[PDB]
From Swiss-Prot, chains A, B, C, D:
Keyword Phosphoprotein: yes
Gene Ontology cellular-component annotations: blood microparticle; chylomicron; collagen-containing extracellular matrix; cytoplasmic vesicle; cytosol; early endosome; endocytic vesicle; endocytic vesicle lumen
Keywords: Amyloid, Amyloidosis, Atherosclerosis, Cholesterol metabolism, Disease variant, Glycation, Glycoprotein, HDL, Lipid metabolism, Lipid transport, Lipoprotein, Neuropathy, Oxidation, Palmitate, Phosphoprotein, Repeat, Secreted, Signal, Steroid metabolism, Sterol metabolism, Transport
Gene name of this polypeptide: APOA1
Major localization listed first in the record, in broad terms: secreted
Tissue distribution of the protein: Major protein of plasma HDL, also found in chylomicrons. Synthesized in the liver and small intestine. The oxidized form at Met-44 and Met-70 is increased in individuals with increased risk for coronary artery disease, such as in carrier of the eNOSa/b genotype and exposure to cigarette smoking. It is also present in increased levels in aortic lesions relative to native ApoA-I and increased levels are seen with increasing severity of disease.
Effect of residue 107 to S: In Boston; correlated with decreased levels of HDL cholesterol; correlated with decreased serum cellular cholesterol efflux; correlated with decreased lecithin-cholesterol acyltransferase (LCAT) activity
Entry protein name: Apolipoprotein A-I
Domain of life: Eukaryota
């Protein structure tokens, strides 16, 4: 029965080698690359430091320089602020006070229609209150049902043990009696299989 | 601030960057690698199935024959199955029945030792039996005790419900009730928000 | 052996066993717990959607109206949008154009400091520029070197293929070739295997 | 706009509490259980040890006792073995020698037909050999194509850097010049949004 089905043998030894064996690519390349790449990137980031270091304090100078111009402007402008600051507050202040007419207006006007619902509602509150509340009474009362149903079962369990522990306990106490075995002569067992085939074929 | 901060900008888009340009390593090389490799492999395997066809006829022509002859072999042998099978069954009882008696010899020869040790262990065998027995009763016994706890604690955690009920009801009432939505105007809201931002720094 | 080994048999089917009998804790209690709890919750929520219906009519009847009035509010206000919008645009240029000049004041007031520091950094700013420049050339330069390696190693790993070719071919020949399948019989095979087992211990 | 959608508030404060708050179950129960369960299971497994300890050597006695009976049987039976041992070898021995007729028979008979394929095959081996082999020549030759196509691209990459590094390098060197900003007066920006709404509504 020629096992030509080794078509794998044909492909594996041929194709697979070229691929798996061409793995030294990332080896010699990538690791050499990343080794020099980031490897010089580290020399540079550290080479740059000294630079940034030999300058920082100098540059620093400039920061205070910005701080200098800054305040001055923050100054000339400061006054214009109040002019607009309190300047606005006022017109807004007045407004709200000139907006209290809306009080007796809006309010006294709405008032009524608003209330409509107060009344169109009230019954429902009452309706639900009487409803949802009792719903929870069913919770406590029902909690007792399950608990009662539970405890009962818990108790029973502890009592079932008495009948269980007993039969199981005949196992070891007497197991030192029936350690009896099968003891197959051995060789004979060989004949057992032996003569069988004589007829199964 | 750190206008120099862009130093890392130049480190990254230079070193680690070219690396990504080499991803095509996996694009052109390994991709084209795998492409032809297994791709021709595909064109290869083809043959095995082809030839297979052109081969099968012969292989089969052959097959049908081999059997035709094998049968010659078989039939010219069977008689030995007898010459042998006979002698085999003979000794079978020589050992089934000459051995049978000794299989009892020990069958009982062991039994003694056992009945011996049986007695020999019984004390301990029982010291434990009755030991865990009463030790088991403790579990059941003290068990129910802590059981009562989970009942006693549940019965109380149950009654604590008629207490966390009432608040929600008020909350109920509340959520139902009207909403006299106060009214400003984006314009007003605008001023508020506005002047709010005019007194910052 | 260890006929007493069954001691652990009794420890396990007793202690850790009853525990599993209490899994129903999660079956009867928490299951029935969650069952009604969220189950009635389900019957509860129902109302909110119901009432909602009976409530919507009113809420809407109301809604349509509130607007009818709000509009009163709005329209009686708009004129202020003018009294205010006017005064607003006024000061707008007071600051757009009175401020505009100072925005340049610094616009250039800063520029100096800059042009200053510009010169102040240039040296370093360039010490680095030309530094990594030539330092970059090294990468390119020495890079191609190790590149040559992966080529040189590939060109050789390529020629090593015309070598692992020939064996498979012989293997080819082989796998093709006939099979003079030697013939025994299960019967014979039986004897072999048989007697094999007769000289063990 | 009455947010009655707090239907969660209604359910959460009610239903959720009873469940999450009934978690003390596994707390007081389970941990008390497993604490006593395995807690006494440990006292027992250790209580049992001493037992097994005060007996082992005793029991041990018995093991040698089995060892005693064992050998004796292993003895009486031992002889019957050879009778069957060499007793079988023989009939099997003869057989194979009386089975050599099958040699000149089976073989010289098959021989021919077998060969048929030797010849019905041979060409195909030759056919495939000439085929599959050249297939691999296409591998080496094609490996060179990709490699050549690759190296080329690798090289180009290292050369592209020269044109890239350059423009990017104007960034930091001069970035110490255009650190120019937006500088929004701030408060004015408030008017920017301010007067906008005046018309968007």
């Amino acid at each position: 029965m020629l096992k030509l089905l080794d078509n794998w043998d044909s492909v594996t030894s041929t194709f697979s080698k070229l691929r798996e064996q061409l793995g030294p690519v990332t080896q010699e390349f990538w690791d050499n690359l990343e080794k020099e790449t980031e490897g010089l990137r580290q020399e540079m980031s550290k080479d740059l430091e000294e630079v940034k270091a030999k300058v920082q304090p100098y540059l620093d100078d400039f920061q205070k320089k910005w701080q200098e111009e800054m305040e001055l402007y923050r100054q000339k402008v400061e006054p214009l602020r109040a002019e607009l600051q309190e300047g606005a507050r006022q017109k807004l202040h007045e407004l709200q006070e000139k907006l209290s007419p809306l009080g007796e207006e809006m309010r006294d006007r709405a008032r009524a229609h608003v209330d409509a619902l107060r009344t169109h509602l009230a019954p429902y509150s009452d309706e639900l209150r009487q409803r949802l509340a009792a719903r929870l009474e069913a919770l406590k009362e029902n909690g007792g049902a399950r608990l009662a149903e539970y405890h009962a079962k818990a108790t029973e369990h502890l009592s079932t043990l008495s009948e269980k522990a007993k039969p199981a306990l005949e196992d070891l106490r007497q197991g030192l009696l029936p350690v009896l075995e099968s003891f197959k002569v051995s060789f004979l067992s060989a004949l057992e299989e032996y003569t069988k085939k004589l007829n199964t074929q």
